[PDB]
Design a binder for this molecule. Structure first.
Ligand SMILES: COC1=C(OC)C(=O)C(C/C=C(\C)CC/C=C(\C)CC/C=C(\C)CC/C=C(/C)CC/C=C(\C)CC/C=C(\C)CC/C=C(\C)CC/C=C(/C)CCC=C(C)C)=C(C)C1=O
Ligand SMILES: CCCCCCCCCCCCCCCCCC(=O)OC[C@H](COP(=O)(O)OCCN)OC(=O)CCCCCCCCCCCCCCCCC
Ligand SMILES: NC(=O)C1=CN([C@@H]2O[C@H](COP(=O)(O)OP(=O)(O)OC[C@H]3O[C@@H](n4cnc5c(N)ncnc54)[C@H](OP(=O)(O)O)[C@@H]3O)[C@@H](O)[C@H]2O)C=CC1
Ligand SMILES: CCCCCCCCCCC[C@H](O)CC(=O)SCCNC(=O)CCNC(=O)[C@H](O)C(C)(C)COP(=O)(O)O
Ligand SMILES: COC1=C(OC)C(=O)C(CC=C(C)C)=C(C)C1=O
Ligand code: SF4
Ligand code: SF4
Lengths: 75, 157, 198, 386, 340, 174, 114
């Protein structure tokens, strides 16, 4: 259950245009990181490749929280 | 004689005679100037008589006759096929539409000449360049080859 | 003087009213040109309905679509004037149904009514930019694969903005902004004197 | 994608620019998506920037196998807009060279069809006859093909003094030349196979996809715009449309050989009954003044200067005029403002519709079948690409 | 004498540089004519190769931009007329093999000195002479040593004549990169000192070309001896393997005494048709790249060097096997950089 | 009036006839006979350099500028040959020659642009620009195809005798 | 005002599609570089895609956005199926063109009209 957060944290910092040590689970891609709308899209996609599950077009819109992403991936 | 220079020239000539007697063309047949070439292949003005084969694929083709407008979409292809031919290769542009741009020079979809996409050796003029004129142009390619002196430059290099 | 046969001018006029009554909706300005040619004009929404009535009506069978074109009157708010020319094999007659479409207000597609239009509608999108809803596969038919801009629009430069040449450095064909060596000489031809309309 | 392959544009098959992407499960074609525009050149936009008489040469290039018949369509169209009609001799000429041109197209279509099939001797046999015809063009227009002879107000110059006689000797014999091709292909035990029952098109479907040509006539629909809506003096002649049944590549072929035959019947008449007269309208307003007149009369120079420099000045209007070009219905929708240069000139190409049908014709067919069907549509990429 | 530069900057525009370029047919040359033609400069290309070979250069030049003149090095008159109407002369005349009736000193020193003398007579504004990098009169390879003699002489025939001195060049159709990659035919790839202690700094051909061209159109370069070098140095080991890496062909770096190897070069040198390796080559290959101490070239002349790994994929792709041609450089491992 | 191109008992005679057609390839042999027949006909080809395909007087061929018999070039730079050229090929700029007469300083026909329509032949009032008979002017370089006044005037002088004969034959028609 | 809708009644319903295309394009880049053997980076290509999508970031009207992706989707379908070749793709990555400066000194020095 945390293992998901372990993978999700690894994916966010690897792209390197985000989380320069400011990575936080409560941190929101759009709300505080400032990462672009599109960049988020890239992120969700990224998570999909490591998880091995492709999340839908819409639910990407609701999760801007790495912790919430782990919430959904566990489901 | 034996001084090599002479020997070389004679040899070159033979080489030139072989390429110049048997030129196997390929006709992209863009547009209409293709119809005026099919006429050359046809009985009044037999191309074969001269050693030009009626048809040939790119691998076995000595000369490419670009007949017709080389439009911007076909421009990448022309090149490909020019690039897919042997080491001794030649291009005879046919038609005002391919020498320059022709009636369609100012258009947005027509390359203004094929010599912007493939190096061109003989330019045959005329909107439907007369078949005799192409034949004249193919014959001038034959005089161009005759003059080429590849081995003598090797020897003198 | 052309050999006009008034017999026609009348019969086609009469059909023009016939259609105008049959489809009071979607049909305006129905007129028979002085060339013995009818040109029903329909609201863009009447594309499907007016065609279908002409393709499948016993008293007006217009089975084949001769052409679908779009003149572009830049002045006109609705820039394009989609014109559909149709032929009646049974009645030996022809009719023109023309609608108006602006750049970003798409017209319905008639591929259903006539499958001939599958290609011409792609041709109108490529050249003029009108879009056709419910089209099976809209995609450039005439322009280059990467072409940007709709060419037959009156606001598009003839020579265009890009031309192609082979570059050795990159060993591949490469666009460059158009540089012409003799610009199109734009002869002004209109005469300042009109012709008293007959 | 069933080893999807793209038919070659350079390929000897095709008219030089057909990139036919075809997904093929082994040797069976699942779907054909023809690509076009390899020969788009701008013919429709270029015309808007040119005067009516300087746009006439574009029409010869639209489908140049049928060099003149195409001009007649623009001619007719410009004449309608001006409400002028050509003089009687010019009309017969246009029908004379209109038909000669049909033969030229059919010799192209039937013999080029065979070359792709693999029969090569019919092409050489009939290209010699073609050659002889070109010479008519040259001795009438000056150019072997791309003449510019049929202008918007009649023909440009009367026939040379002696052409009619030669368009007779040729016609008197050409038949045997068609007969020969026949003894080689009409009943070949093998032509039939590769052609029969290939690309059958229903009658209802042919009208629906706008085929409008031999392709319709081959399916048994009776429509020849030359009999249904007579243009020029094709009304005064008598010919039989060659309708077909069991429409398929072989049947339509037979139809094209039969119109070659019927056109000789129309040519004969035109030679037998061509009237003494002028070959261009007498309205210096539309037709350029004779050179003796422009060099001796002021009104003629003024009319020569204005016509060549500025133009006809067609009255504002729009018309769709369709003839029966050898391929099928060739029509010009020429919208025109009062200006001397046109506003729009959509060329309806019998061929844009025919290619589209390739998909609905070549279904569950082998690679060789696709080659046969492109032939039975007489696709000249100039008219399709325009 | 000049041509005001009008135009937007592309083909069919004018830049006002009429330039004789005697050795244009060359690998470097091809590129020099490319930019000069792109810019719109008037380019006179003297040629002694057959017309069929010179055809590739025709298309990059615009109509009337490129003029080709028949020229013989031994015949002084040919050089005379070539520079008659040029205002810029660029000399790229060199051949790594010593051909039977053109020896190394003649191509590297005698032919340039005469060419430079001609343009001083003609009144050409500037002459650019190209000599190999690290070239000293007492160096190991004759080619280099001679080239060094040459740069001196031409100074006296033509004072204030720019002398760009490029390192071995990296580019498609180059030797530096293709040569090593072509060692595939050889089962084993000999490498003196097992490819060590001969750190080398390649430079992309274009960078060199652009640099050269920029010289033609800049007053800052007079008597300057620029050195186009590169964006990263390399011990010959990584270079060799890297190459084999992109080529996706095995690597067996085998030590072989340069002594014995100079002999292998002699063997190929013996061959009549363009020896593939040269005694003079061999030395050059194991001749260590000199640290930049001469006038800065790239960047200094306006072009930022381009790393080897970036375009290597294009140069070595043909060397590659049936498979692995879709292999791309970033999934591949870039070799380490040794500045030493 | 229409016609059915292909619109259509079993008797031993009939069948045996049909079976023989399939079994011994009778119609195939018919086709071979036709080609053997021509093999015996005289070939229609012409020795191209030695014998030339016939072209009558109106053949447009290659552009030339004529001169008056006196020697004054016919063109008076009205420039409508430029106006009616469909391809924009002819470029003309003029200025009054010292004589005071009107002549063209530069007359450039771009032959690669030209589509040999022959309207220029038509348009000229003095008939200075004519479509000359020669069709063989293929050139090694693109620049040679661009033609200035001196090449066309030189072309005119070389072919004037035949051009005059050709115009002589066809002027009544025009 | 008062304009009929092409695809999305409102921008928030259209951005959706813009993104979906963004997803599709994102995944496509890698495959193209390999199939067309291009000289570019997977990341580089993905960078260009970003550039393009952003170029037209300013559009506020829903109808314009819908047709932009209509065009965008056909673009990738030709990009895929390898209808566009290497030459039509690499063109996006403009090369062989001297980027024209925008500094006034640069425009004043070369080019009569800025
Ligand atoms: C596309 O490639 C081509 C073909 O394939 C379709 C052809 O077959 C053809 C048509 C075939 C032809 C009859 C013409 C070409 C003929 C030849 C290559 C003949 C070759 C001649 C020889 C090698 C003679 C052999 C002589 C000796 C070794 C004698 C020694 C004692 C052509 C021209 C072609 O271009
Ligand atoms: C007591 C008696 C005992 C013996 C009894 C004997 C009974 C009589 C003989 C019976 C058989 C006679 C014929 C045998 C050979 C022909 C066999 C045959 O049927 O041909 C196959 C094919 C048929 O044509 P097709 O229409 O495709 O088929 C219809 C049925 N599906 O036909 C073809 O497609 C042919 C295609 C040919 C293509 C090339 C043609 C070349 C023609 C010129 C050369 C002819 C041969 C020259 C030989 C020279 C000497 C070797
Ligand atoms: N590529 C390299 O290895 C490097 C080269 N350089 C220098 O740059 C210059 C260009 O290099 P590169 O293009 O590779 O050299 P090339 O081997 O390509 O030859 C350059 C040109 O010199 C001409 N040439 C050679 N010998 C003679 C001769 N006897 N008479 C007349 N012309 C001759 C050749 O013409 P043709 O073949 O038609 O006779 C060729 O076009 C060289 O001179 C070299 O010193 C510097 C660093 C690295
Ligand atoms: C290397 C491969 C080449 C592939 C290149 C590609 O095919 C070409 C291409 O991307 S074509 C780009 C056009 N793509 C758009 O035009 C979308 C516009 N989308 C919007 O405008 C939105 O409605 C919004 C207002 C929210 C933007 O706001 P935001 O700032 O992006 O958040
Ligand atoms: C008109 O279209 C064309 C063809 O198919 C009809 C050809 O086969 C060919 C090939 C014919 C020859 C002369 C080899 C050409 C040139 C062409 O353009
Ligand atoms: S040149 Fe004349 S003939 Fe040859 S293609 Fe262009 S138009 Fe058709
Ligand atoms: S028309 Fe005849 S005369 Fe007038 S300019 Fe053109 S050529 Fe000279």
């Amino acid at each position: 259950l945390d293992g998901i957060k372990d993978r999700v944290l690894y994916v966010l910092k690897l792209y390197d245009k985000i989380d320069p040590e400011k990575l936080s689970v409560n941190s929101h891609f759009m709300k505080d990181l400032g990462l672009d709308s599109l960049d988020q899209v890239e992120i969700i996609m990224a998570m999909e490749d490591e998880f091995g599950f492709e999340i839908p077009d819409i639910d990407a819109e609701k999760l801007m929280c790495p912790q919430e992403i782990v919430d959904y991936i566990a489901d | 004689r034996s001084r090599a220079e002479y020997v070389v020239t004679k040899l070159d000539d033979l080489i030139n005679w072989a390429r110049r007697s048997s030129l196997w063309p390929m006709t992209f047949g863009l547009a209409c100037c293709a119809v005026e070439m099919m006429h050359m292949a046809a009985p009044r003005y037999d191309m074969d008589r001269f050693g030009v084969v009626f048809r040939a694929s790119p691998r076995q083709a000595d000369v490419m006759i670009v007949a017709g407008t080389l439009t911007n979409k076909m421009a990448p292809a022309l090149r490909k096929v020019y690039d897919q031919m042997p080491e001794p290769r030649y291009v005879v542009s046919m038609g005002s539409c391919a020498n320059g741009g022709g009636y369609y020079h100012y258009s947005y979809s027509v390359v203004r000449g094929c010599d912007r996409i493939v190096p061109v050796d003989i330019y045959v003029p005329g909107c439907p360049p007369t078949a005799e004129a192409l034949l004249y142009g193919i014959l001038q390619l034959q005089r161009k080859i005759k003059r080429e002196q590849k081995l003598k430059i090797w020897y003198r290099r | 003087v052309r050999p006009r046969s008034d017999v026609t001018h009348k019969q086609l006029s009469a059909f023009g009213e016939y259609v105008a009554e049959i489809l009071p909706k979607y049909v305006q300005q129905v007129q028979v040109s002085c060339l013995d040619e009818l040109e029903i004009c329909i609201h863009p929404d009447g594309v499907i309905p007016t065609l279908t009535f002409l393709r499948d009506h016993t008293n007006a069978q217009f089975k084949s679509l001769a052409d679908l074109t779009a003149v572009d009157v830049p002045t006109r708010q609705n820039r394009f004037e989609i014109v559909y020319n149709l032929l009646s094999l049974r009645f030996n007659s022809r009719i023109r149904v023309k609608t108006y479409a602006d750049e970003l207000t798409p017209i319905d597609s008639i591929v259903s009514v006539h499958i001939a239009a599958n290609w011409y509608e792609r041709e109108v999108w490529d050249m003029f930019g009108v879009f056709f809803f419910n089209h099976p596969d809209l995609r450039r038919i005439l322009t280059d694969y990467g072409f940007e801009g709709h060419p037959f629009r009156k606001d598009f430069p003839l020579t265009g903005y890009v031309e192609l040449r082979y570059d050795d450095e990159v060993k591949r064909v490469v666009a460059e902004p158009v540089e012409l060596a003799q610009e199109f000489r734009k002869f002004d031809l209109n005469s300042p004197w009109e012709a008293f309309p007959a | 994608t069933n080893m999807t392959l793209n038919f070659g544009p350079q390929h000897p098959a095709a008219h030089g620019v057909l990139r036919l992407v075809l997904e093929l499960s082994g040797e069976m074609v699942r779907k054909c998506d023809p690509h076009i525009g390899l020969l788009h050149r701008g013919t429709e936009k270029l015309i808007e920037y040119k005067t009516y008489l300087q746009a006439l040469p574009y029409f010869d290039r639209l489908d140049y196998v049928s060099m003149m018949c195409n001009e007649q369509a623009y001619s007719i169209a410009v004449e309608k807009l001006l409400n002028i009609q050509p003089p009687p001799r010019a009309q017969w000429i246009r029908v004379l060279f209109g038909e000669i041109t049909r033969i030229l197209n059919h010799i192209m279509a039937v013999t080029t069809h065979a070359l792709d099939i693999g029969a090569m001797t019919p092409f050489f046999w009939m290209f010699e006859e073609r050659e002889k015809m070109f010479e008519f063009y040259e001795r009438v227009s000056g150019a072997r093909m791309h003449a510019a002879y049929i202008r918007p107000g009649g023909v440009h110059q009367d026939l040379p003094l002696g052409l009619l006689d030669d368009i007779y000797e040729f016609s008197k014999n050409f038949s045997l030349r068609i007969d020969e091709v026949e003894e080689m292909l009409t009943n070949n035990r093998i032509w039939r196979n590769r052609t029969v029952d290939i690309g059958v098109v229903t009658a209802e479907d042919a009208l629906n996809y706008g085929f409008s040509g031999v392709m319709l006539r081959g399916s048994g629909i009776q429509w020849d715009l030359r009999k249904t809506q007579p243009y020029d003096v094709y009304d005064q002649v008598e010919f039989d449309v060659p309708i077909g049944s069991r429409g398929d590549c072989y049947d339509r072929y037979l139809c094209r050989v039969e119109e070659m035959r019927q056109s000789l019947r129309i040519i004969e008449q035109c030679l037998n009954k061509m009237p003494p007269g002028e070959i261009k309208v007498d309205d210096a307003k539309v037709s350029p003044p004779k050179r003796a007149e422009m060099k001796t009369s002021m009104e003629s120079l003024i009319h020569h200067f204005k016509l060549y420099t500025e133009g006809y000045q067609v009255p504002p209007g729009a018309t769709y005029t369709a003839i029966e070009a050898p391929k099928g219905e060739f029509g010009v929708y020429l919208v025109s403002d009062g200006s001397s240069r046109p506003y729009r000139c959509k060329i309806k190409a019998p061929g844009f519709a025919h290619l589209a049908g390739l998909d609905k014709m070549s279904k569950g067919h082998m690679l060789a079948d696709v080659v046969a069907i492109i032939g039975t549509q007489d696709i000249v990429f100039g008219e399709i690409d325009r | 004498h000049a041509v005001i530069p009008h135009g937007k900057g592309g083909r069919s525009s004018v830049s006002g540089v009429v330039a004789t370029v005697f050795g244009a047919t060359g690998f470097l040359g091809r590129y020099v004519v490319n930019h000069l033609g792109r810019m719109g400069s008037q380019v006179i290309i003297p040629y002694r190769c057959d017309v069929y070979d010179i055809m590739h250069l025709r298309l990059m030049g615009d109509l009337g931009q490129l003029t080709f003149l028949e020229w013989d090095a031994r015949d002084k008159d040919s050089i005379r007329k070539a520079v008659q109407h040029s205002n810029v002369v660029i000399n790229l005349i060199g051949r790594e093999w010593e051909t039977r009736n053109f020896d190394f000193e003649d191509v590297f020193v005698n032919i340039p000195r005469a060419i430079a003398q001609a343009s001083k007579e003609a009144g050409v504004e500037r002459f650019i002479h190209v000599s190999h990098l690290n070239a000293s009169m007492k160096s190991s390879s004759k080619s280099l040593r001679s080239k060094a003699v040459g740069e001196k002489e031409v100074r006296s025939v033509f004072p204030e004549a720019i002398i760009i001195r490029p390192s071995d060049i990296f580019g498609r159709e180059d030797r530096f990169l293709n040569h090593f990659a072509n060692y595939r035919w050889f089962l084993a790839v000999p490498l003196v000192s097992l490819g060590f202690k001969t750190v080398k700094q390649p430079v992309y051909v274009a960078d060199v070309s652009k640099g050269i061209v920029n010289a033609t159109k800049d007053p800052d370069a007079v008597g300057k001896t620029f050195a186009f070098t590169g964006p990263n140095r390399y011990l010959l080991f990584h270079l060799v393997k890297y190459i084999f890496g992109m080529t996706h062909r095995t690597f067996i770096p085998y030590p072989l005494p340069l002594f014995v190897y100079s002999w292998i070069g002699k063997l190929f040198g013996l061959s009549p048709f363009e020896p593939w390796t040269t005694k003079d080559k061999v030395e050059r290959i194991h001749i260590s790249d000199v640290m930049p101490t001469d006038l800065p070239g790239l960047e200094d002349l306006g072009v930022q060097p381009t790393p080897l790994e970036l375009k290597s994929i294009e140069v070595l792709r043909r060397h590659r096997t049936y498979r692995w041609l879709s292999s791309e450089i970033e999934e591949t491992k870039p070799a380490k950089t040794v500045n030493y | 009036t229409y016609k059915y191109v292909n619109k259509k008992e079993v008797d031993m005679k009939s069948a045996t006839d049909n079976a023989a057609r399939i079994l011994m390839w009778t119609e195939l042999i018919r086709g071979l006979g036709m080609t053997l027949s021509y093999l015996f006909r005289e070939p229609a080809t012409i020795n191209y350099p030695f014998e030339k395909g016939p072209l009558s007087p109106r053949f447009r061929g290659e552009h030339a500028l004529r001169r008056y018999p006196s020697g004054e070039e016919r063109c008076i730079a009205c420039k409508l040959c430029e106006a009616i050229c469909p391809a924009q090929a002819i470029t003309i700029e003029a200025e009054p020659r010292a004589d005071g007469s009107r002549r063209t300083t530069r007359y450039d026909i771009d032959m690669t642009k030209c589509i040999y329509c022959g309207f220029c032949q038509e348009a000229c009032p003095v008939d200075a620009i004519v479509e000359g008979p020669n069709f063989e002017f293929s050139t090694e370089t693109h620049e040679e195809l661009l033609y200035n006044k001196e090449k066309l005037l030189n072309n005119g002088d070389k072919w004037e005798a035949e051009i005059a004969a050709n115009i002589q034959a066809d002027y009544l028609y025009r | 005002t008062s304009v009929k809708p092409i695809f999305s009644r409102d921008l928030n319903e259209a951005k959706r599609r813009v993104r979906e295309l963004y997803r599709a394009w994102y995944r496509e880049v890698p495959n193209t570089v390999h199939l067309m053997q291009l000289d570019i980076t997977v990341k580089q290509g993905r960078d260009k895609v970003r550039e393009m999508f952003m170029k037209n970031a300013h559009v506020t009207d829903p109808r314009v956005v819908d047709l932009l992706v209509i065009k965008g989707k056909m673009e990738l379908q030709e990009t895929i199926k390898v209808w566009k070749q290497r030459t039509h793709v690499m063109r996006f990555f403009h090369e062989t063109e001297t980027p024209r400066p925008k500094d006034f000194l640069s425009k004043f020095y070369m080019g009569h009209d800025p």
